[PDB]
Structures are given as C-alpha cells and as structure tokens.
Subunit: 318 residues, 3 copies
C-alpha cells in the first residue's frame, strides 16, 4: 500500500558471470522459503513478474580472458528491460539472483527511469575490475566498471555489452563490507574517490555511524531513489555460507539487518538486488537453509520488518 | 559481606507458563553447575531458600485461550511471598527459573518491600501481551501486562491472579534485546511510551551507550533498587541454545556480561531472575552445558565478577 | 622495501613455560601455512633467521612451585640475543612461538637496541604473576613481572634468570583483551597504574576507540618503537581454538585485524610476537587450520595487508 512496500519481483536464474553452477537456483530457493507470502504478511503490495527466461548462448568464447561475455551481456540486457518495466509500473524492483554480473542490467534498467539514483553496494568485494584488470575473467567481479561514467574509455568493446551506457558517477555509489579487494580495484577506488566502508571502517566506527554517514552522503544534498545491491557474501560465511566467493570476517547478521532497516526507513528504496545465493554450495542442508533464511530476513527488513516490532494503525487494546 | 553481594537464592522449578517440559529443571542444572559455590568464592554471603514446592493443579482449564492460568497464578503468588521474605531479610533475591511467567511473582514480591524499584528486562521478547492480545495463550509471554499500572483495566479477571496488584508504571521498566515483538505488544510499547533498546538500538549505539542510557534513565532522578529480569533467550542462541523461544541475532556473550557488570557496579541490584533455561532442549549435551555455563557467568557478573579481575583488600605483593 | 615491511623471522619452538606439549610446533605450522611467501607477496623484505635450537636442560627441578625455570630462562636468554641481532640488522623482529614465557627474551632483546620501546600486549591474561603470586607455577603466566622495573625487588633470584634486567616501566605497556586475571595480578595492575582495556572496556568503547586511546597513550608524547606481543588466546576460541589457555568471550577476528591494521599504520612496529599456537590442541584438523590461518592473517595485517585493499605505485588502468 505504501510506496516503500509496493514491489515487483523479478527472478534472474543466471550463473554465467562466474564458474559455479547452482546460483541459478537462487530465485527458486528464495521463493520456496516463502519470500512472497512473507512480504504480503507485512502489508506489501507484491507483484511477481516471474523468472526471466535466459536463452542459452552456445557460441560464447572468451573475450581475451573474460568468460561467457555474450551470455552475461544478454542476461543483463534482458534484466534491464524488465527492471525498467517494473519501475514504470511504480514498483520497487526486487531482483532475485543469480550472480552479481546481473547488477549491470538491474542498475542500468533502474537508471533508465530514475537517472538520479544512488547505489549502496553491500559486498566483501568491490566488483569493479574492468575487462583489462580482471585476472579471473569472471564477470560477476566486474559489474561496477561497466556502470561507471569515469571508466567509459577503459572498458573495451566486449561482445554482448554494446547496449550498455554507463549511468552512475563515482560519487553515486557507497560500498559497505569490503575485505577482499584486488590491487587494480583498489587503484580504481582511490583514483576515483569512491566512498567506501571496508570492514576496517565498520570496526572503527560501528555500523550505526557507517549508515548515518552512508545515507548523509547519498541523500544530504537532496533526496533521490536508492538502489541496494546486496551480495550475500557481504555477510560473514557463518551466516551465508552457501555462496561462491566467501570471505571470513564479514558483516554480522545484526549488521545486515541494521543496514537494511535503515535503508527502509528513508522511504527511498527504489531497487533491490539479492544476489549470489548458491544452494549447491552448502556443505550441509542446514548451511543452505541458514543462507536462504538470512537472505529472506535481509529482504524483509528492506520492506519494513523491524526488530522492535510492527503494528497496523488500529487500537490493539480495543 | 557487601550489600551488593548478600544473596537469597530461590529455586522456582515451574514450567506451566509455556508448553515445553524441561524448564522446571533450570534450578537443578544451575545448582549442579556450582552456582552457589562459585558465588561464595567471590565473597558473597549466600543463603539458599531452597526450591519452591509448586503443588499440582489438575483442574486448570484454559481461560479463553490462556493456558494453565491457575497453576501460573498460584506459582507466582507463592514466589511473591518468598521473594518478599528474602527482601525483608536484607538480601538480593536470586530467582532461578523456570519460565518467565514467574516474573509476575518475582517483581510483585520485590515491590512489596521496595515499591520504588526499576526493572531492566533482558529478552528477545517484550512479554507484554495481555490475556486478550495473546495469540499463543502462553503466560510466559504476558507477565509485564499484569505488572503495569497503565494496563489495569485491560487485564480481565483471570483465575489465579486475583492477588495481583500492578506495581510498576510504564516509566519504571527498560527493555534490552528485543527482536521478536508481536503487533499488539508493539502497540502497547508505543502507546505507553516504554523505554526500550531493541537489537536495532544496540546495533546503532553499542552496548556501552545502551547501558549508560538505561541506567541514567532509571537512576538519574534518584537512586532506587534495580530488578533485573534476565531471559536467557535475550542472548543469541549460539550462546544459550537450550531455551524454548530462541531468536537469532541476539545479544552476544560479551554484551550479556557488559549489561550485568554495569548493573552490578551501581550497587543497586536488589532482585534478579535467571529465567527460561531448559536443558531438555539442547540438541546435544554440549548445547546444554553451553547454555547453563553462560547463565552462571551472567549470574556471577551480577554479583561482582569482573572481566578485568577482582582482588581482596590486602597487599598481594606481601 | 619500506622499514615497516622489512622483517627478520625467528622461530622459537619452545614449550616449557607451560604444561602442554605441542606449542613447540607453532613455528612449523605457521611456516607450513606459507607465512614467509605471503609476506613476500605483500612487498616485504623477509629474512628467515631460522628456528632457535633450544638445548634440553634435563636437570631443572622447580624453584618453589615455579616449573622448568632454567629451561625457560635459557630459552629467553637465547631469544633475547637473536632478537637484538635482528634489530641491529635494521629489521622488525617476528618471533613465532612457542609459549608466552618467550616474551621475556623477545622484549628484553628488543629493548637492548630500542630502550624507548612501548609494548602492546594482546591476551586474555595479564601474564604478570610473579614467582611468588603464581599458583600454577607456569612461567608463561609470569613474563611481564620479570620485565617491569617497578617489580624488581618482588622477583626472587630464580635459576635461569640472572641475566634479566627489567627494561620497561608500568607506563610503557598497554593490555588489550583481558578477561581472566588472577587476584594478585589484578592487585599489581591497579597498584602500578598500568593502562588496560579488558573485554569490558572493549565492549564499552568499541575497538575503534580502544586503538585510538592505546596509540595516543603510547605515542602521544613522542614517537617510539612499538613491540606487539600477541597471544592467540586474546581472540575468542571460536577463532583460535588450538591454544592451551582458551577463555570464552574474546576479541573477534575483525577486532584482531583492526588492532594490527592500526598498529601497522603507525609505521612504528618494531617487534612482534605471535605466541601460543598449539596445533596438538585442535579438537579436529579444521580447528588447527582455523587457528593457524587466523594467526597468519593477524601477522599479515601487522606488515600492511589491509582489508580495504593494497596496490603498488603504478597506474593500473594503463
Ligand atoms: N575480485 C575477484 C572476485 C569477484 C567476486 C564477485 B562477487 O562479489 O560478485 O561475488 C574477481 O574479480 O574475480
Ligand atoms: N510473544 C510470544 C512469545 C513469548 C515468549 C516468552 B518469553 O520471552 O518469556 O520466552 C507469545 O506471546 O507467546
Ligand atoms: N594466570 C594463569 C594463566 C596464565 C596464562 C598464560 B598465557 O596468557 O601466556 O597463555 C597462570 O598464572 O597460570
Ligand atoms: Mn558481488
Ligand atoms: Mn563479493
Ligand atoms: Mn521472557
Ligand atoms: Mn523471550
Ligand atoms: Mn600470554
Ligand atoms: Mn593468555
Ligand atoms: Na558474491
Ligand atoms: Na524465553
Ligand atoms: Na595463551
């Protein structure tokens, strides 16, 4: 009913931004966990736009060392179109991933409708390698480079990405959670003057101050739509173990909920990505459920579920 | 010897405030863990008033959906009498639970002797459902409603509770740890203007600031006796798993000790409840010991055990 | 190449400061974990001075209740000589322990070259029992007493320690992590006015403020060399389980990295001890690797590995 609780879900069952099979099941496991029902229970208007059908691209040889470029490019192109449709329908886009390369499409599509958007990127990694700085060639570690205006002339013409137009400036993104940043990525971060809170900053300041500073930075001048791109590897693997690039020393479950509670309360959440859940990578069934349950919790916080409690505007004592 | 270390232990082996058998063994396991000996080792004057004999009440059909009302009411009536006796003996009452419905008796009895008492309630839950807002009917989720003066006309005449006189005002209680609050409960919390620190606040402020604010709020105007009612479910289930209503994202072991260290240092601790330890609910024997050991640690902190260390007033270098 | 990254490694495979066999394997497991290679990868100039050969001292009966005094005294004497050699070579000494009694030699040797050094002691314990206050007789719980000038006349003539000259004053050491302090030790701490941050302080202030205060205290007046003596039991046993005197409620992995990141950034790290890793005490092989991996991580942070990332002074986009 409220704008902050009016939602369009998009499943993006896609894995070719990285090597490990299984992340394409993220949308299924999150749905099976009752995500849609649980959103409706907390007074959300929820429309399911379904799972995007990503067509196989059998002929997709590497571009230099960059892997599956055409598949990744097309999946993001399709996703951009669907996100823009959801935004034009007046809904918060909720993308269930799928690997993080999809943020190229998610943010691109969002920005077509709301070009003034600000991005909060919750991740152990900066995901800001270019096709030339990457050493893995995995496109889930490169999405931010494709989106950044300052980097336009450093991105080669990669097959599958001719549709991309960089849509955010270095000032329009804040990182939270960083703890495994490649040297080239660190160079870009410092060269461009991008705002970040690595785990060192979170330890120094506390998540309270991190969020105050994050939101003041993005929203101080003027209010604008927020895009939250949440890689579950941002949280410590003790919370989200079933993911492809875990890094110890992460955000706690509490910190994850704080981040998302605070974002919800701005009333400005406009796009959300819940990325990199890979149920095939749980060592045990409990590791899977633990990961999926945490992802659902984070998502519910984004749409108003508060640890202090919630109530409808009625007299409960009558 | 010191007033803050002069203690009267009361076992309250009672479970009928909630469904799960086993919480009636809390006093046994805590005693078996060496709680009394360990208190004596840290220079406490400890008198054991024994385990209260709660008589079976075979005829105890629900009041509307409220379960075991007469059993719960009588157990709390008996406990109130025993707590008041301990307080008149000049001792800090230490109630070993048993389920949290017993706080009706513990706080009531305490307040008979010290009507100016302030309550700190450490819990994942507010325990403030009335007999009419509850959906579970479990009385361990309702004790605060029976104690609050503002709610007198919203509590029906429940069999077993005719002896109850509400003894605290909304201003005399502070919650710490909240993370699973029912809608009706949240309505009451906001309507009455009760001070609380949900996990969101603890994340925002840090436990340091939470305790400073808690104690300033309760003790700023004037010093008065403190009643600490500690539900072990306030701590994350990674610390206290053997409990009936666990909720993830809880207070850490460190935060639990900080809370209780700070309360100890006021010199004003006057009543303590250590509630909801249920050894039957440990998945493994280690989960039981982990839970019991944490409860003992928390309790020892309440009576002066400090992480920085403790020493007698003698020259240790001579 | 940088002074803060120019290192001399000393293995100290020694266990007789305490009862448990296995801590003498610390240097082996840390080396086997790739510590030296990993230091070189982050642009350190690393010289390996090898493992010290500690000769068996078969005739070493207790001094009162103090155990293996001659063995412990000689091992520290040898280590002092080697540390001083490394310091005269212009390198940061990196002592791989081995039990914490070795800090007598490590700090002594360091202070021969840099008498103005300041010590940061990361530990669950104060390790400041004298031969007369100790109740265990284990010399790993006494090193600080031998080093402190204020305690000279309280240390008896223990066989093996006639070479020791106390080299630090009470003002030159800061403790971080304390949570199991003996009464005599607490007496010494308060009598001498030693700066400490027990876990209570870390909880109160946050590790951010703890480090700011620690470094301001030691370096405010004037810059001087820092000696970090890091007992892995300072970290919670969930992180470093394979150690002889674990105590729950410890520093987190994140807090450990924060401490060492901040120390690195002063440019003043001059001596480092990584102590009490005992692979024989892991309940499982994973507990061993977890402990060793954490120790390596802590060590790499000391020599410039930063969670925000690191890069060489080149243009990565060219
Ligand atoms: N920086 C590494 C890791 C990328 C991790 C990607 B992510 O955050 O989306 O899981 C790479 O370029 O391959
Ligand atoms: N609010 C729920 C849960 C109560 C939990 C009670 B407690 O905190 O004492 O374990 C109920 O009314 O049943
Ligand atoms: N205070 C105890 C414990 C000493 C622990 C030593 B350590 O910190 O180096 O492991 C003793 O004197 O034996
Ligand atoms: Mn990512
Ligand atoms: Mn990542
Ligand atoms: Mn309770
Ligand atoms: Mn509770
Ligand atoms: Mn030590
Ligand atoms: Mn120690
Ligand atoms: Na990831
Ligand atoms: Na409970
Ligand atoms: Na140790």
């Amino acid at each position: 009913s409220a704008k902050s609780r009016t939602i369009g879900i998009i499943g993006a069952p896609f894995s070719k931004g990285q090597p490990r099979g299984g992340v394409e099941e993220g949308p299924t496991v999150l749905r099976k966990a009752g995500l849609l029902e649980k959103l409706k229970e907390q007074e959300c208007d929820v429309k399911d736009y379904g799972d995007l059908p990503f067509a196989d691209i059998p002929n997709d040889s590497p571009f230099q060392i960059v892997k599956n470029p055409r598949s990744v490019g097309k999946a993001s192109e399709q996703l951009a179109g669907k996100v823009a449709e959801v935004k034009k329908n007046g809904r918060i886009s909720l993308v269930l991933g799928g690997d993080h390369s999809l943020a190229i499409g998610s943010i691109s599509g969002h920005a077509r409708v709301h070009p003034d958007l600000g991005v909060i990127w919750v991740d152990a990694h900066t995901d800001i390698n270019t096709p030339l700085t990457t050493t893995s060639g995995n496109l889930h570690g490169q999405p931010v480079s494709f989106l950044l205006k300052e980097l336009k002339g450093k991105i080669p013409d990669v097959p599958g990405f001719s549709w991309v137009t960089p849509c955010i400036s270095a000032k329009d993104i804040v990182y939270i959670g960083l703890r495994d940043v490649d040297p080239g990525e660190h160079y870009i971060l410092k060269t461009l003057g991008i705002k970040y809170f690595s785990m060192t900053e979170v330890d120094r300041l506390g998540i309270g101050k991190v969020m105050e500073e994050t939101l003041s930075y993005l929203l101080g001048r003027k209010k604008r739509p927020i895009h939250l791109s949440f890689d579950v590897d941002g949280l410590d693997p003790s919370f989200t173990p079933a993911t492809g690039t875990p890094v110890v020393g992460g955000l706690t479950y509490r910190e994850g909920l704080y981040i998302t509670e605070e974002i919800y309360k701005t009333g400005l959440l406009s796009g959300l990505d819940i990325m990199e859940v890979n149920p095939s990578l749980g060592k045990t069934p409990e590791e899977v459920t633990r990961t999926v349950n945490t992802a659902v919790a984070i998502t519910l916080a984004c749409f108003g579920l508060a640890r202090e409690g919630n109530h409808k505007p009625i007299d409960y004592l009558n």
